[PDB]
Structure formats: C-alpha cells, structure tokens
Amino acid sequence: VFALGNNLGSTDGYLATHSQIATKTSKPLLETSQTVSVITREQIDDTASKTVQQAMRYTPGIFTGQVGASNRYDYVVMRGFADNSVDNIYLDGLKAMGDSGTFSSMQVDPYFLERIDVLKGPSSVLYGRSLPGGLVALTSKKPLYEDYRQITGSIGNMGQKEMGFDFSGPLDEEKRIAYRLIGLGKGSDTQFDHVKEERYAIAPTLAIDFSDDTTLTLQGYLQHDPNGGYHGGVPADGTLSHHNGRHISREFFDGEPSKDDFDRTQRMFGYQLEHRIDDVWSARQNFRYLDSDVDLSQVYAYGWSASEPNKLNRYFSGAREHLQAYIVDNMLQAEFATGAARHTLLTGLDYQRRRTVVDWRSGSASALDAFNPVYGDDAISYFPDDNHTRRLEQTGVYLQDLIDIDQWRFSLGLRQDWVSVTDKNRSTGSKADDDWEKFTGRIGALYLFDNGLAPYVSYSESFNPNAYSDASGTPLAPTEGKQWELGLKFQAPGSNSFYTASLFHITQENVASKEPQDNFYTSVGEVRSQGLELEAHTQLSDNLKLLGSYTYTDITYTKSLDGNQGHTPNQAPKHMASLWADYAFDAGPLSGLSIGGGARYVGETWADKENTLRVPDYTLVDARIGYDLGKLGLKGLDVSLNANNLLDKDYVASCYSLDFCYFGEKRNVTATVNYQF
Numbered sequence: 001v002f003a004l005g006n007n008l009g010s011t012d013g014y015l016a017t018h019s020q021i022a023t024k025t026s027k028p029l030l031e032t033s034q035t036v037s038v039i040t041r042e043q044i045d046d047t048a049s050k051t052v053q054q055a056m057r058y059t060p061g062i063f064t065g066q067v068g069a070s071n072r073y074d075y076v077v078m079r080g081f082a083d084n085s086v087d088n089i090y091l092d093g094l095k096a097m098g099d100s101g102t103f104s105s106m107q108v109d110p111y112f113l114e115r116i117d118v119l120k121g122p123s124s125v126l127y128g129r130s131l132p133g134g135l136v137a138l139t140s141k142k143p144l145y146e147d148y149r150q151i152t153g154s155i156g157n158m159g160q161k162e163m164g165f166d167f168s169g170p171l172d173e174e175k176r177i178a179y180r181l182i183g184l185g186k187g188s189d190t191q192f193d194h195v196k197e198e199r200y201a202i203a204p205t206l207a208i209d210f211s212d213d214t215t216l217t218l219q220g221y222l223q224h225d226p227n228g229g230y231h232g233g234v235p236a237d238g239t240l241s242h243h244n245g246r247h248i249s250r251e252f253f254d255g256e257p258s259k260d261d262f263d264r265t266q267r268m269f270g271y272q273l274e275h276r277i278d279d280v281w282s283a284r285q286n287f288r289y290l291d292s293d294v295d296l297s298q299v300y301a302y303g304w305s306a307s308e309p310n311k312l313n314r315y316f317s318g319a320r321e322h323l324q325a326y327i328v329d330n331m332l333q334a335e336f337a338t339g340a341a342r343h344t345l346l347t348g349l350d351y352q353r354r355r356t357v358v359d360w361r362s363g364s365a366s367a368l369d370a371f372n373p374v375y376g377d378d379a380i381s382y383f384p385d386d387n388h389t390r391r392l393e394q395t396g397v398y399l400q401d402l403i404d405i406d407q408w409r410f411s412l413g414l415r416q417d418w419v420s421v422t423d424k425n426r427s428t429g430s431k432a433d434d435d436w437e438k439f440t441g442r443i444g445a446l447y448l449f450d451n452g453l454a455p456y457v458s459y460s461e462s463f464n465p466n467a468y469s470d471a472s473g474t475p476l477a478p479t480e481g482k483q484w485e486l487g488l489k490f491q492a493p494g495s496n497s498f499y500t501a502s503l504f505h506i507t508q509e510n511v512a513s514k515e516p517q518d519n520f521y522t523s524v525g526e527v528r529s530q531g532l533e534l535e536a537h538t539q540l541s542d543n544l545k546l547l548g549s550y551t552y553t554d555i556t557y558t559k560s561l562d563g564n565q566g567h568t569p570n571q572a573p574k575h576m577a578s579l580w581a582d583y584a585f586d587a588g589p590l591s592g593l594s595i596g597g598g599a600r601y602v603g604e605t606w607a608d609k610e611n612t613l614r615v616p617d618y619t620l621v622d623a624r625i626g627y628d629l630g631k632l633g634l635k636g637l638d639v640s641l642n643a644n645n646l647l648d649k650d651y652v653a654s655c656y657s658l659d660f661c662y663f664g665e666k667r668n669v670t671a672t673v674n675y676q677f
C-alpha cells in the first residue's frame with residue numbers, strides 16, 4: 001500500500017490515474033484541486049524523448065525553447081515564468097539541489113525515469129522555495145518484485161549512439177528484497193559544428209521490507225557528462241533577419257574547438273524509509289546527498305564587431321565548480337474519520353543545506369566570422385578572476401489537511417520557512433549573509449459529481465530568494481507568487497479518457513527593478529500571468545492513443561522602473577497547442593506494428609524585454625514506427641524508428657535578448673532495439 005509520498009495510481013497508455021505531486025500523498029488527479037499533468041514512461045519512449053525538458057514538449061502551459069536545441073540543462077518555462085527555469089525540477093520528492101546562480105545545475109537522464117509529474121502554479125506550501133509557474137517532479141524507477149531485464153540500443157543522425165540496460169528483480173525467496181540496476185552510455189554530435197555530447201551513468205537501487213509495515217529503499221545515481229554539447233546563442237540580427245544579406249547557419253559554432261569544454265560529474269546517493277504505524281498513522285523519511293563537479297571552458301559570441309563587418313565579438317567564460325548538497329524530508333501522516341468527514345492530515349519537516357565553491361575566470365577572445373569562420377585563434381585576454389563560496393539553508397515546517405466530506409474534497413496547507421543564504425567573495429574577502437522567514441498558505445475546494453465531473457477552485461502561494469541585491473549590497477526580499485485558479489476535470493468512469501481546463505491568475509511580487517540610469521535594484525517590480533490551459537488524453541479504442549493540449553498565456557510586467565512597466569516578457573508565447581496520436585495494429589496481417597506521430601504549435605514570442613520584434617511562430621511534426629518482432633516469434637524483441645521535427649524546419653526557438661537567439665533542433669531520426677530476457 002502506502003499512500004504517503006507515493007503516486008500509487010494506475011497507468012494505461014499515456015494516462016496516469018493518481019499523483020502525489022500536489023499532496024505528498026497519493027490522490028487521484030480527478031480529486032485534486034490543482035492542475036497536474038503526468039507524462040508516462042510510454043509517452044517518453046513513443047515520442048523518443050531525450051531529456052526531461054523535451055519530454056514536456058507535448059504538455060500544456062510549458063515552453064520548451066528557452067535555449068532552443070541545447071541539451072545541457074533542463075529549462076522548464078511554466079506559465080511564462082522563464083527566470084530560474086533551471087530550478088523547477090524535483091526528484092523522488094526532493095528538490096534537485098542545483099545552484100541556478102552557477103553552472104552547477106544537475107540533469108536527470110530520462111532513461112532512469114518511470115514518470116514525470118507537472119504541478120502548475122505556486123506550490124511552496126509543500127516544497128518551500130520555488131517559482132510561480134509551478135514545478136516538475138521526476139519519479140525514479142524502483143526495484144521490481146518480478147524478474148525484468150531489458151537491453152536497448154539506439155542509433156541516429158548527428159552521430160547519435162546509445163546503450164542502456166535495465167535489470168530488476170527480487171533477491172530473496174520470499175520477495176521481500178529486490179534490486180534494480182540501470183546503466184547507460186550515449187554520445188552525440190549535434191547540429192552544431194565541432195560539438196560533442198557524451199554521457200555515462202549507473203543507478204543502483206535496493207528495496208527491503210523489514211516487514212509488511214516498514215520498507216527501506218536505498219538509491220545511488222552516478223553520472224559523468226565528459227562533454228556538454230552546445231550551450232550558446234547568436235545575435236538576432238541575421239538569424240531573424242538578413243545580416244549584410246546573409247543568414248547564420250543552424251550548425252554554426254561560436255566557440256573555439258581548442259577551448260570548448262563542459263565536464264559535469266554528478267554523484268548522488270539517498271534513501272526513502274517508509275513506516276506504517278497504524279491504519280491511521282504513517283511516517284516517511286526521504287533523504288538525498290549530492291556531490292558534483294563542473295568544469296567549463298566556453299568562448300561565445302556576444303554581439304557584432306563594431307569594426308569587422310561579418311565577425312562577432314567574442315568573450316570567454318571559465319569555471320571550476322564543486323557543489324555539495326544535503327536534503328531530508330520528514331513526514332508524518334494521520335488518516336482518520338470525524339463523523340462524516342474523512343481526514344488525511346500531514347505534518348512535515350524538511351531541511352536543505354547547500355554549498356557551492358566556484359572559481360570563475362573570464363576574458364576577451366578574438367572576433368569570429370559568422371559566415372565561413374576560421375577557428376584556432378584562441379588566445380584569451382583575461383579579466384579579473386571572480387571566486388565565491390555560496391551557501392543556502394532552508395528549514396521548512398508544513399501542515400496539510402485533505403478533508404473529504406460527501407462529494408466535497410478540500411485541501412488546506414500552511415508552511416513556515418527559515419532561509420539563510422550566504423555568498424563569500426573569496427577574491428575580495430567580503431561576505432553577504434542574509435536570513436529570512438516566510439509563511440505560505442494554500443486552500444483548495446473541489447466538488448466530485450457522480451459522473452466524473454469535478455469543478456474546483458484553488459488559492460496558492462510561493463516564494464523564492466531574490467537573485468538581486470539593492471543599493472547597499474544586501475539581497476532584496478524574496479519574490480512572491482500568489483495564484484487564483486479555477487478548473488474543471490472530467491473522466492467518464494468507463495473511459496480511459498481524461499479532460500481538464502484550467503484558468504489561472506498569477507501575481508509575482510518583490511521583483512527586482514531599477515531605472516536604466518541606476519546600478520542599484522529595488523524590489524518594486526511586479527509580473528502578472530493569466531490564461532487558460534486545456535488538456536485531453538483519449539483512448540478511442542485499445543489501439544488508438546491520443547493526447548492534445550491548448551495553452552493561452554498573457555504575461556505582463558505590470559510594474560517596472562526600467563521603462564518596461566507595460567510590456568510582455570520574451571520567451572513567452574501567447575498561444576501554444578499540441579496533438580499526438582499512436583495507432584497499434586493488434587490483429588490481422590499488420591499485428592505487432594505500431595504507427596504514431598503528432599504536431600505541436602508555438603505562437604510568436606518576443607525576442608527581447610524591450611519588445612522590438614517577434615520570433616516567428618513555428619509548427620513541428622513528429623512521427624514514429626514500432627514493430628514488436630515477438631509477433632514474428634522472437635518474444636521480447638521489438639524495434640522502433642522515430643523522427644522529431646520531421647519537416648526539418650529552420651527556426652529560432654526563442655531569444656533571451658537581441659544579442660542571444662537559439663536555433664531549434666533539426667530533424668532527429670532514431671532507430672531503437674529493445675530486448676527483454
């Protein structure tokens with residue numbers, strides 16, 4: 001059993017029935033007064049999904065183009081909140097613990113994942129520090145109690161190759177002890193000249209039942225990315241328009257092949273202890289330690305040379321980083337009745353402690369011709385080194401009551417947080433030391449009709465430490481999100497279909513803002529995001545699987561000192577939609593064959609905060625072919641072929657500014673072989 005900290009749903013095709021993302025305790029999606037999406041293991045594979053970021057490319061309210069084709073980090077823009085989008089990821093109930101103010105942001109390979117859960121809007125009441133768009137919860141693969149052995153191989157264009165294996169099963173005659181061990185190797189060239197991606201990772205897991213009342217799960221995850229692909233951008237001039245009559249290629253490398261390194265070693269171990277006391281009382285401890293090394297050498301373009309017609313000015317960034325982080329979550333849940341009301345009452349205490357030691361170097365590099373470049377002129381003019389030790393501590397105390405009474409489903413949550421953040425400029429010897437406490441709350445109400453219709457309303461709050469500091473060097477007040485949400489959910493009790501609509505209004509406060517004149521920030525900015533999401537998961541037969549989505553997002557700087565009080569953030573499409581279908585032939589000559597694909601639409605986005613032109617809209621097509629050769633008498637063998645961006649469209653996915661625009665991925669074609677023993 002054991003609802004606390006577990007999804008416990010069911011899954012069929014692309015549709016999950018339950019999640020714990022919104023509650024830290026298993027709850028049907030239909031009875032949860034929040035917007036929750038679930039991306040199934042099957043959805044990841046069918047779409048040939050290569051990262052967490054890309055796996056959401058079919059999910060409403062999520063923009064997946066912040067840095068275009070780059071795969072170095074998972075940038076998850078939620079409900080138009082692009083800033084700190086790298087810090088939205090949770091793994092097995094615990095904040096991932098990257099430091100978004102450094103290069104040490106972690107990435108979880110999808111091959112280790114069983115599910116991806118997406119919670120929209122402010123959600124600090126259960127998690128502490130987080131962004132106003134929502135958050136993403138990855139659920140790792142766990143030991144199975146029956147033997148499972150899979151081997152997979154993939155090959156593609158762009159020099160892609162990959163190997164994985166996934167073995168699981170019980171170790172004891174009684175099936176109280178089970179393991180899973182997963183490993184993988186991969187490599188890629190990318191559309192971009194002279195770039196490599198490469199990764200090696202292994203994940204051991206051990207599960208032990210001390211009895212029916214107690215389970216301990218032991219986890220390891222060790223990952224080495226000796227190369228980091230491409231993580232650059234080029235000027236809008238001449239990507240979005242011609243530059244002296246020519247266009248920059250989508251394969252252009254703005255760096256120096258002799259000085260382009262990204263080495264990230266991420267080492268994690270942890271455990272989850274599950275103890276049932278009573279049919280009433282349950283307790284859980286989730287724990288994870290992280291230790292990572294990141295090494296970076298990057299020459300990048302930054303604007304056009306003022307003197308040399310078709311050359312870009314270039315600069316150099318260098319970094320060596322060591323990140324350490326501890327996270328524990330202590331949960332105690334009471335399940336009990338009080339007359340007609342059934343209560344699910346949760347109390348928790350969590351603790352985050354992080355230290356990041358960063359030695360940064362920078363300088364000026366030679367200009368580079370943006371059309372027919374000559375590489376090799378790699379001398380750097382160094383700027384002053386900039387060395388820091390960064391520390392963060394977060395202690396949270398939270399309370400939640402899920403109250404079900406007749407057809408009502410209510411949610412009440414409160415959390416008090418103590419945050420301490422410090423930054424020792426180790427070059428200068430100075431230290432910024434700041435302590436804060438924040439109170440956050442959430443209240444939800446949903447009415448469940450007996451046909452599977454569920455209207456609901458939600459109010460929810462969030463906070464995040466401010467990345468900026470004021471006229472005295474003291475960091476500003478944490479930013480704050482507040483959200484009103486209205487929704488409607490529908491599942492016909494027969495069907496394997498599910499439909500939702502969500503209407504949202506998010507206000508974000510204490511955003512840093514200053515007049516262009518000034519060098520100092522004040523916490524007087526405000527941002528508002530409002531809109532509508534529609535999501536459809538259908539099975540119209542036991543062969544035909546559907547997904548669809550529509551997103552309308554109106555985000556605006558409602559208060560700014562910098563001239564921008566009235567503008568729309570860049571990297572924030574007003575309109576998005578997507579649709580994916582998969583058809584499996586199940587009897588007859590074609591049996592064992594599967595066919596699939598889909599299309600996703602992103603509306604225009606602004607290239608800059610100043611709003612001076614648009615990044616055009618784009619429509620991409622995906623397609624798939626699978627064949628289970630077991631149907632030809634070799635059981636456990638299946639093969640598939642995938643193509644994303646099937647029409648090979650050449651587009652800018654987005655721009656962070658007028659200097660930095662990113663290309664979308666060209667067609668990515670994959671062939672996969674899966675064999676179970």
Ligand SMILES: O=C1CCC(=O)N(O)CCCCCNC(=O)CCC(=O)N(O)CCCCCN1
Nearest residue numbers: 073083084085086099100101102103104105231
């Ligand atoms: O370590 C760093 C920041 C991290 C970074 O920049 N990465 O690229 C790594 C990925 C983490 C976040 C994704 N990027 C952003 O959120 C854009 C940040 C931005 O606007 N800047 O100007 C840069 C910040 C100035 C200091 C530069 N040094």
Ligand SMILES: O=C1CCC(=O)N(O)CCCCCNC(=O)CCC(=O)N(O)CCCCCN1
Nearest residue numbers: 067231232233234298300301302317656660661
């Ligand atoms: O140069 C720095 C510090 C180094 C750094 O932060 N790097 O990422 C490495 C080099 C950036 C190259 C372009 N990177 C992108 O366009 C992705 C977004 C991003 O990462 N930014 O930092 C946005 C601003 C980058 C310019 C200002 N800051």
Ligand SMILES: O=C1CCC(=O)N(O)CCCCCNC(=O)CCC(=O)N(O)CCCCCN1
Nearest residue numbers: 083467468512570608609655656657658659660
């Ligand atoms: O304002 C700051 C700190 C805030 C920050 O880092 N932002 O990104 C603010 C978001 C608006 C700017 C969008 N992007 C760019 O201008 C490109 C690279 C970048 O991001 N820079 O900051 C380098 C610009 C120098 C600005 C001075 N430093």
Ligand SMILES: [Fe+3]
Nearest residue numbers: 102103231317
């Ligand atoms: Fe950067």
